[PDB]
Short mmCIF file of N, CA and C in Angstrom, two decimals:
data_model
loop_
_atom_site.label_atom_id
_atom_site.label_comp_id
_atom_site.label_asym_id
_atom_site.label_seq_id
_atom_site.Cartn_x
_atom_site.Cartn_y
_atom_site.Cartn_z
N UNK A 56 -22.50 -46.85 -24.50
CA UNK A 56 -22.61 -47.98 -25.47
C UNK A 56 -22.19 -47.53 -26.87
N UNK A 57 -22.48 -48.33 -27.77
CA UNK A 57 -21.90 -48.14 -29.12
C UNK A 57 -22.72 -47.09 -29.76
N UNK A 58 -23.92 -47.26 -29.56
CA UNK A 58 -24.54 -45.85 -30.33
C UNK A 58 -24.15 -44.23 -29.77
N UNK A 59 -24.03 -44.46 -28.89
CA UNK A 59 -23.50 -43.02 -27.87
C UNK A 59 -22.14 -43.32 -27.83
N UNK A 60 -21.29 -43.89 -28.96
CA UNK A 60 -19.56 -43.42 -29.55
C UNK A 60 -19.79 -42.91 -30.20
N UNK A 61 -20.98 -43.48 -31.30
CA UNK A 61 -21.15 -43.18 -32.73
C UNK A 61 -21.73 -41.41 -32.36
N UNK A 62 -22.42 -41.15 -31.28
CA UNK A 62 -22.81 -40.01 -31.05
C UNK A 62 -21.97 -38.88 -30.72
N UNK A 63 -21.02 -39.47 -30.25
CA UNK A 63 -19.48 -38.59 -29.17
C UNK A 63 -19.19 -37.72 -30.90
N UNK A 64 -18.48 -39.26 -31.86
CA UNK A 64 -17.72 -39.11 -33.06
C UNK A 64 -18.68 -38.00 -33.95
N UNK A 65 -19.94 -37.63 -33.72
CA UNK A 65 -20.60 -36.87 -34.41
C UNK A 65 -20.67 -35.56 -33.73
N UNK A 66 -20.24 -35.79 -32.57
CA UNK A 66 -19.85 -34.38 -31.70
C UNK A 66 -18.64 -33.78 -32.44
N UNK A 67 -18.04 -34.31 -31.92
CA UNK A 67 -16.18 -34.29 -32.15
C UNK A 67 -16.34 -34.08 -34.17
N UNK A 68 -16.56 -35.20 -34.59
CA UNK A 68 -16.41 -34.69 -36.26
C UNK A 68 -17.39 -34.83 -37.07
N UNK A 69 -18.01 -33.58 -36.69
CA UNK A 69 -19.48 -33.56 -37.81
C UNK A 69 -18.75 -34.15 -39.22
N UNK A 70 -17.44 -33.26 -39.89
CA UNK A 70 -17.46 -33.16 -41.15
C UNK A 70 -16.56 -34.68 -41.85
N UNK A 71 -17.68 -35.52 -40.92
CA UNK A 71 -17.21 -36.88 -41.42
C UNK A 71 -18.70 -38.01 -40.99
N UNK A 72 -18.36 -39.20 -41.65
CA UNK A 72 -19.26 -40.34 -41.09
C UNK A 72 -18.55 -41.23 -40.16
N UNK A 73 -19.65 -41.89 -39.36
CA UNK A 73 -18.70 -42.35 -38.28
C UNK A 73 -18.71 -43.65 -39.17
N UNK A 74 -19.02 -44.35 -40.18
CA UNK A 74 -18.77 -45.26 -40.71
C UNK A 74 -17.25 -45.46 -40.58
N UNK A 75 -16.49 -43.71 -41.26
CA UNK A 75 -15.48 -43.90 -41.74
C UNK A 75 -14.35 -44.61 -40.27
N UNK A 76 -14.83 -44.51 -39.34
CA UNK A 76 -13.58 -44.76 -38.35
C UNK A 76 -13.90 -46.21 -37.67
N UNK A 77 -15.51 -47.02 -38.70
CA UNK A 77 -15.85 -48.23 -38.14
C UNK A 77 -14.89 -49.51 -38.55
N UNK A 78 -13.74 -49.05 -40.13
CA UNK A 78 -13.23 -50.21 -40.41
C UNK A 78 -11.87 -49.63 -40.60
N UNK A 79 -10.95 -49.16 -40.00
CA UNK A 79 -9.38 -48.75 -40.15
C UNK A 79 -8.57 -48.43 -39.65
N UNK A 80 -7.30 -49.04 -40.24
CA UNK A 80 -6.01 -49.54 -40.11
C UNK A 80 -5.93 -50.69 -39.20
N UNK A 81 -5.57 -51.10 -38.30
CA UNK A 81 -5.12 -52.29 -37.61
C UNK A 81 -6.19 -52.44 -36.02
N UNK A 82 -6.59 -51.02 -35.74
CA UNK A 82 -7.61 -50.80 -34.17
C UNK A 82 -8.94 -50.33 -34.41
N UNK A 83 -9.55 -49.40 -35.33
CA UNK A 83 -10.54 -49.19 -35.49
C UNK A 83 -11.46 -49.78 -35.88
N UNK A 84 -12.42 -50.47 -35.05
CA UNK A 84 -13.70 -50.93 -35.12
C UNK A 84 -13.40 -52.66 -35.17
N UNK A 85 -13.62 -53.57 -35.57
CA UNK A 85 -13.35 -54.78 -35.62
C UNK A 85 -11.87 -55.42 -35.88
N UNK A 86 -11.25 -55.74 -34.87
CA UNK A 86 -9.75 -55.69 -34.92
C UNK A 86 -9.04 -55.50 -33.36
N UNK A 87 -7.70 -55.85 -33.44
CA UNK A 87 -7.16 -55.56 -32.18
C UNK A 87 -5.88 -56.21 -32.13
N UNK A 88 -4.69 -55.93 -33.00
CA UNK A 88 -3.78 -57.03 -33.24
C UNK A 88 -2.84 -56.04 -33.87
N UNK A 89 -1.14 -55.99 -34.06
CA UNK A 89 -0.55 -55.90 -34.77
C UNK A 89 -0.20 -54.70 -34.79
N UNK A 90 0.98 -53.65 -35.68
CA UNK A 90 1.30 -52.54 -35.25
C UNK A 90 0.52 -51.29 -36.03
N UNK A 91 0.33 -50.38 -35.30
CA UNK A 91 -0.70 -49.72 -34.89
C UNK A 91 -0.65 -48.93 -36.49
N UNK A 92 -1.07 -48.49 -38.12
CA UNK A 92 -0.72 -47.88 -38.81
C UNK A 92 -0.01 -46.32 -38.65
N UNK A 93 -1.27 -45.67 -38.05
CA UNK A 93 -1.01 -44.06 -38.27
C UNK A 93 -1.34 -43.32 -36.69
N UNK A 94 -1.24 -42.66 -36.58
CA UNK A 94 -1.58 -41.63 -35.12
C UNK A 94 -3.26 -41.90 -35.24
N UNK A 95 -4.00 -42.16 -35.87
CA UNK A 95 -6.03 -42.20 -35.78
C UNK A 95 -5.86 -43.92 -35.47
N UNK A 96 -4.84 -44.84 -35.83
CA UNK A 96 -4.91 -46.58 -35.35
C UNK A 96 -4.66 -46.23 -34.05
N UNK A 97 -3.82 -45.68 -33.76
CA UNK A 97 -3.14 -45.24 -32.38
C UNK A 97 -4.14 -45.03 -31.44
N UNK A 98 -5.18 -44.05 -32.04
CA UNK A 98 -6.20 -43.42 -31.18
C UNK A 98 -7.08 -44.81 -30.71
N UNK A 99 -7.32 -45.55 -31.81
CA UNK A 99 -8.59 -46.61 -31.35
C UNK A 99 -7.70 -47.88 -31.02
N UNK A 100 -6.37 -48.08 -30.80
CA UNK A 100 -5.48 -48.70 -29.97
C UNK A 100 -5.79 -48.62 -28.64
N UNK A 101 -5.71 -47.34 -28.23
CA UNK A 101 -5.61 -46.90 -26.74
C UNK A 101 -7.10 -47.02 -26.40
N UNK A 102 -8.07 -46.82 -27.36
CA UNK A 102 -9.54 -46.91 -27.24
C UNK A 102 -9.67 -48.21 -26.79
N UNK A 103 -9.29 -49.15 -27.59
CA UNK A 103 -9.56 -50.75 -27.35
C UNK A 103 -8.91 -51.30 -26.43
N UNK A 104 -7.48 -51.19 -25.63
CA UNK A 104 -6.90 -51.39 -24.61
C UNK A 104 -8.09 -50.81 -23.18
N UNK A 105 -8.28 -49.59 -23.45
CA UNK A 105 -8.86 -49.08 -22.37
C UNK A 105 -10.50 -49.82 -21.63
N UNK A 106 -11.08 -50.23 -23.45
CA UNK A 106 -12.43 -51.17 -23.10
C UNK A 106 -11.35 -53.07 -22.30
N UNK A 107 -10.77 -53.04 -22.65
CA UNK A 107 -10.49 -53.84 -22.07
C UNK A 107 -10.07 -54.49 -20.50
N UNK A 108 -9.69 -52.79 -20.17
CA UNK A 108 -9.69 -52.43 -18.97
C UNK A 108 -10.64 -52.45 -18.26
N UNK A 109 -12.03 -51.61 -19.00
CA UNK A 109 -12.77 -51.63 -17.92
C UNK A 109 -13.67 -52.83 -17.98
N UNK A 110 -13.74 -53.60 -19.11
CA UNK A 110 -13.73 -55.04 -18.48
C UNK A 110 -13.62 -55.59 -17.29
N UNK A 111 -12.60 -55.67 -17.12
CA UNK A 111 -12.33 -55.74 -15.92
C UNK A 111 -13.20 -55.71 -14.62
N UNK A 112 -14.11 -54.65 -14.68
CA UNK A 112 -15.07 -54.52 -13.90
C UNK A 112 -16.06 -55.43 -14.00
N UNK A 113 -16.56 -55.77 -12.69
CA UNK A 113 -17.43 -57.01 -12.39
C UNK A 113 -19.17 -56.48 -13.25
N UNK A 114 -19.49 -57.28 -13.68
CA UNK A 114 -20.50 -56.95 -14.94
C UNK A 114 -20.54 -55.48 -15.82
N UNK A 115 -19.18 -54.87 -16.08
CA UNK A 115 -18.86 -54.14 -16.91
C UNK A 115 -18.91 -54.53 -18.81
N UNK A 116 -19.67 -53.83 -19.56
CA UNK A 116 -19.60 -54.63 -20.79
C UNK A 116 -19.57 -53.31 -21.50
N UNK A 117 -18.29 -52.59 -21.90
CA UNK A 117 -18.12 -51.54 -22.68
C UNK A 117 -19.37 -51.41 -23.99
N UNK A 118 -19.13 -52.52 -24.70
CA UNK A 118 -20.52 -52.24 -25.83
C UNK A 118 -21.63 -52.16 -25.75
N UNK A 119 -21.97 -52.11 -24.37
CA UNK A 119 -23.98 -52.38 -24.00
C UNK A 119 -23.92 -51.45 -23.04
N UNK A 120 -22.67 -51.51 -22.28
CA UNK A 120 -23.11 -50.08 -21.18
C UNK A 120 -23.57 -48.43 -21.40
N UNK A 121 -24.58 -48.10 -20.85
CA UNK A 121 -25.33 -46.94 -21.33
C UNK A 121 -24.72 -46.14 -20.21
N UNK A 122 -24.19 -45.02 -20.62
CA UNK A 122 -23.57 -43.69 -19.38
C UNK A 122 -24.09 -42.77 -19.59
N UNK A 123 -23.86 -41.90 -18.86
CA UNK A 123 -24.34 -40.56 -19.01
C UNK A 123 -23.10 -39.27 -19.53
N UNK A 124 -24.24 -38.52 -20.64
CA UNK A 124 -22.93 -37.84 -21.02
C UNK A 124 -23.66 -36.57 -21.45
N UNK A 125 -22.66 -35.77 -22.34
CA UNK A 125 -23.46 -34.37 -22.91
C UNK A 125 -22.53 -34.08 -23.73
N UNK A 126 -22.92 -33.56 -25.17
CA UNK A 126 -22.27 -33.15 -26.22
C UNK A 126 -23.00 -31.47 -26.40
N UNK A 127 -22.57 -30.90 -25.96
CA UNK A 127 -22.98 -29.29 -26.35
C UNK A 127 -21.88 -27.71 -26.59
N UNK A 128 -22.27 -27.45 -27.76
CA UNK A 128 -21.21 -26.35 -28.18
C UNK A 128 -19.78 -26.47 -27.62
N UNK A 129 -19.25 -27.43 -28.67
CA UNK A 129 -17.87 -27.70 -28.82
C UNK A 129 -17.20 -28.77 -27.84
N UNK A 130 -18.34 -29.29 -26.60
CA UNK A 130 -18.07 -29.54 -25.37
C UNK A 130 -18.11 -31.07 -25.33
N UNK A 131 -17.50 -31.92 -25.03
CA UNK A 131 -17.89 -33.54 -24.36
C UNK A 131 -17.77 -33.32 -22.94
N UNK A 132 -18.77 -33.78 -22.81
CA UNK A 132 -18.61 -34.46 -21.13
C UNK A 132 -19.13 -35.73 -20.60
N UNK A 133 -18.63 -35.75 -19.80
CA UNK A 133 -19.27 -37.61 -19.33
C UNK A 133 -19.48 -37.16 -17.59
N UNK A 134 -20.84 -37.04 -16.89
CA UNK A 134 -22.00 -36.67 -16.30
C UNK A 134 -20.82 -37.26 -14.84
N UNK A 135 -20.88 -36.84 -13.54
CA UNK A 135 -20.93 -37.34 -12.57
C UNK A 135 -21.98 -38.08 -11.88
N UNK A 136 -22.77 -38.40 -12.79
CA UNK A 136 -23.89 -39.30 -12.65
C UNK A 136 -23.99 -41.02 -13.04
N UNK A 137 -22.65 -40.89 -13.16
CA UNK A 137 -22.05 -42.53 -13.42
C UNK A 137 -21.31 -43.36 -12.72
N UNK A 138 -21.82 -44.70 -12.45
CA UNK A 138 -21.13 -45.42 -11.80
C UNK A 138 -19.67 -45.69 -12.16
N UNK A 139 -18.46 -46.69 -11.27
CA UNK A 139 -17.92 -46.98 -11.98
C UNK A 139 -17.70 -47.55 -13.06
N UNK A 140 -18.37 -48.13 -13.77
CA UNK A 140 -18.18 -49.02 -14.71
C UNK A 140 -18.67 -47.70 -15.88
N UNK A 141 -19.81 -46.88 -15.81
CA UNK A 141 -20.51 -45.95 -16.57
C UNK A 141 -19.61 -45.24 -17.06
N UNK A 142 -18.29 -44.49 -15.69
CA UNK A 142 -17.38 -43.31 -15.69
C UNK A 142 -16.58 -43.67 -16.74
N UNK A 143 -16.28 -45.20 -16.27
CA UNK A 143 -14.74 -45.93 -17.21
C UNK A 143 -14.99 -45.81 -18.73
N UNK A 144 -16.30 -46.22 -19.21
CA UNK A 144 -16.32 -46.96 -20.80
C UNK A 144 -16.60 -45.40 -21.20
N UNK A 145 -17.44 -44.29 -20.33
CA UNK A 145 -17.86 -42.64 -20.98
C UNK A 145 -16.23 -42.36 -20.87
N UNK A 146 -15.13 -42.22 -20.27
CA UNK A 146 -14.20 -41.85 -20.51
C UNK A 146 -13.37 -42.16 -21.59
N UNK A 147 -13.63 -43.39 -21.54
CA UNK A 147 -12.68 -44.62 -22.97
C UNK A 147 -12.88 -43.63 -24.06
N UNK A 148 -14.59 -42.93 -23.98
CA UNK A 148 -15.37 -43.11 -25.37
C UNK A 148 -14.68 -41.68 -25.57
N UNK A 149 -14.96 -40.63 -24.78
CA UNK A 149 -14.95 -39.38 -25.02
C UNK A 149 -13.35 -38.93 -25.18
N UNK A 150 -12.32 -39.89 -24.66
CA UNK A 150 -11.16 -39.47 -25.25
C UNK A 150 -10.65 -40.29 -26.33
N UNK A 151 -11.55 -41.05 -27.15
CA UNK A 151 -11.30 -41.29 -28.32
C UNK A 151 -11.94 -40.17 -29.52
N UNK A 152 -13.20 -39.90 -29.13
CA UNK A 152 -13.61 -38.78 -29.97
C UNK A 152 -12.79 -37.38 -30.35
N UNK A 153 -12.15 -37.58 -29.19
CA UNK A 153 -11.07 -36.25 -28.91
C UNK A 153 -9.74 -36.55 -29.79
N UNK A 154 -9.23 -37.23 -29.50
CA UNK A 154 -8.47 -38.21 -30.47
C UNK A 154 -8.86 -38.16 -31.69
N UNK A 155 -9.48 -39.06 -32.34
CA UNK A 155 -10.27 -39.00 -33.93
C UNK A 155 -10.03 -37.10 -34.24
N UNK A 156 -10.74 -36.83 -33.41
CA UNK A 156 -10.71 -34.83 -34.63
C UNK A 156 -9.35 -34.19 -34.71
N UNK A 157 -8.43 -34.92 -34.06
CA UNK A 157 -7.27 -34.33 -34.00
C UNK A 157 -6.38 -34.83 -34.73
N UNK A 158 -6.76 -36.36 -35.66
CA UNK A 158 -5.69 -37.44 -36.12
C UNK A 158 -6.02 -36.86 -37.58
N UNK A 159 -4.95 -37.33 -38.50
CA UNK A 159 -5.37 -37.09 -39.65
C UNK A 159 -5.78 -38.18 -39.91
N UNK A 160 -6.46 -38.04 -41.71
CA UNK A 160 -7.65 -39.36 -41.82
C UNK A 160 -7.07 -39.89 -42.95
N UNK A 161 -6.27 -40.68 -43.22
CA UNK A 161 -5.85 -41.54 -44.67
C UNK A 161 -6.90 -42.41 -45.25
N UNK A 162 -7.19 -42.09 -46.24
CA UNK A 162 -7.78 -42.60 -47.11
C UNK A 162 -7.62 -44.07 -47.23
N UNK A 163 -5.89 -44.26 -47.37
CA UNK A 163 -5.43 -45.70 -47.72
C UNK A 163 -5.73 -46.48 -46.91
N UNK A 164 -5.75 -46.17 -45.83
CA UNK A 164 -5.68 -46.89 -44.69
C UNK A 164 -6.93 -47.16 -44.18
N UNK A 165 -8.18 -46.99 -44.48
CA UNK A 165 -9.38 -47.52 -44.52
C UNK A 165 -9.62 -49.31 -45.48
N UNK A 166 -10.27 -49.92 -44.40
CA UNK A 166 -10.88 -51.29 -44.45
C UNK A 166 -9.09 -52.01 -45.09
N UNK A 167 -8.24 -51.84 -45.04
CA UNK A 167 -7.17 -52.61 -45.19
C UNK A 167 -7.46 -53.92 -44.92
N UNK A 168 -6.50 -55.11 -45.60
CA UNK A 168 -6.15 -56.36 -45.05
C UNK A 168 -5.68 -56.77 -43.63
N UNK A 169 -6.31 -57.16 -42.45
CA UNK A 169 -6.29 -57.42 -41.34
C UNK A 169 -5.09 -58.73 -41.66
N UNK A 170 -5.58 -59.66 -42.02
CA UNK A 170 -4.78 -60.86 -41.99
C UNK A 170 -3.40 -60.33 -42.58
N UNK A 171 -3.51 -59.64 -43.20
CA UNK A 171 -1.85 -59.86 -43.91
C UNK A 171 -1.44 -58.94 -43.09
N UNK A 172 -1.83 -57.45 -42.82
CA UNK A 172 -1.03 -56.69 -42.50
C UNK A 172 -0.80 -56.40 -40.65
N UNK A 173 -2.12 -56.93 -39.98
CA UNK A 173 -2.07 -57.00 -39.30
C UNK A 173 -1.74 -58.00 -38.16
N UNK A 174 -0.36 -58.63 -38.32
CA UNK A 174 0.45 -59.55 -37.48
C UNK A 174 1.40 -59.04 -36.59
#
């Protein structure tokens, strides 16, 4: 679920807030439209395509589903203790976190204009 992203993103990048990746460029956090800004839009592009996917699954709900996972010394994992629907949204999550520490972070490109720029 959403608190256990916010948990992944604190795995993956202590030396940030996960606020910062709740409102930016065109995919991160509320949004889903238009071309992608930088390689970190990119990341929560493929993030948000992928919840959409596992949609898909018959009472699958990426934002409420609780999985099983483990964040320890340097490590993500997502538990073989998950159903399908559990495996899909812990995977979505944990290769976005992986993603995020690897993207660079523009400043500018935080809470931007959705409507204008994102068509």
């Amino acid at each position: 679920n959403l608190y256990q992203f916010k948990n992944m993103i604190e795995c993956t990048v202590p030396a940030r807030s996960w606020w910062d990746f709740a409102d930016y460029g065109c995919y991160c956090g509320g949004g889903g439209s238009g071309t992608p800004t930088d390689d970190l839009d990119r990341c929560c592009q493929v993030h948000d395509n992928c919840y959409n996917q596992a949609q898909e699954i018959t009472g699958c709900r990426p934002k409420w589903k609780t999985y099983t996972y483990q964040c320890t010394q340097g490590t993500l994992t997502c538990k073989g203790r998950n159903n399908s629907c559990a495996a899909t949204t812990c995977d979505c999550d944990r290769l976005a976190a992986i993603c995020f520490a690897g993207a660079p972070y523009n400043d500018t490109n935080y809470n931007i204009d959705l409507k204008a720029r994102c068509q």
